[PDB]
Design a protein around this ligand. Structure first.
Ligand code: HEM
Length: 152
């Protein structure tokens, strides 16, 4: 569990992210696609994108980035009590999209890298550790749902 102090660090930097959801959302998906090309293959919707320039130019990609961050934002603001928000997400990603747990770890690294790049002053080592724990909590709860459904 994260302490109240750790949650405050997480939410403080997340408030900054909400000032430019589209920009943050776009950078995170591009980071993920570049570092782990296999993740792009899960998206029939973005499979055609080959270069980073093509990726930055896609409005549909930017739109999806907003969907991912707003859904994650809703979860983080729940400070651990995210049962109702997480269940639906685990179900679709396990049974419909077929997203292995490892890919969730990849996008977690992408989120941390982007937060560090856009907010050096508010994303120090202490905030970085708090965010990592929050994302680990996110992955832990999702993995439990996957196991229940038979997806590891
Ligand atoms: C921070 C973690 C993530 C969050 C919050 C998230 C959230 C969402 C949401 C809200 C949707 C739309 C509704 C739904 O189907 O549930 C969605 C769709 C989808 N997600 Fe994720 N996702 C995450 C990570 C990933 C990862 C790591 C992958 C793939 C490697 C992925 C692949 C997909 C795909 C393929 C769709 C369907 C896209 C379409 O055809 O419109 N997601 N995700």
């Amino acid at each position: 569990v994260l302490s109240e102090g750790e949650w405050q660090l997480v939410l403080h930097v997340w408030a900054k992210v909400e000032a430019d959801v589209a920009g943050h959302g776009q950078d995170i998906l591009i980071r993920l696609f570049k570092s782990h090309p296999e993740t792009l293959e899960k998206f029939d919707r973005f499979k055609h994108l080959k270069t980073e320039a093509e990726m930055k130019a896609s409005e549909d990609l930017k739109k999806h980035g907003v969907t991912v961050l707003t859904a994650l934002g809703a979860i983080l603001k729940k400070k651990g009590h995210h049962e109702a928000e997480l269940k639906p997400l685990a179900q679709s990603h396990a049974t419909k999209h077929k997203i292995p747990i490892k890919y969730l770890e990849f996008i977690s690294e992408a989120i941390i890298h982007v937060l560090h790049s856009r907010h050096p002053g508010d994303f120090g080592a202490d905030a970085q550790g708090a965010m990592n724990k929050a994302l680990e909590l996110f992955r832990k709860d999702i993995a439990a749902k996957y196991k229940e459904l038979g997806y590891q």
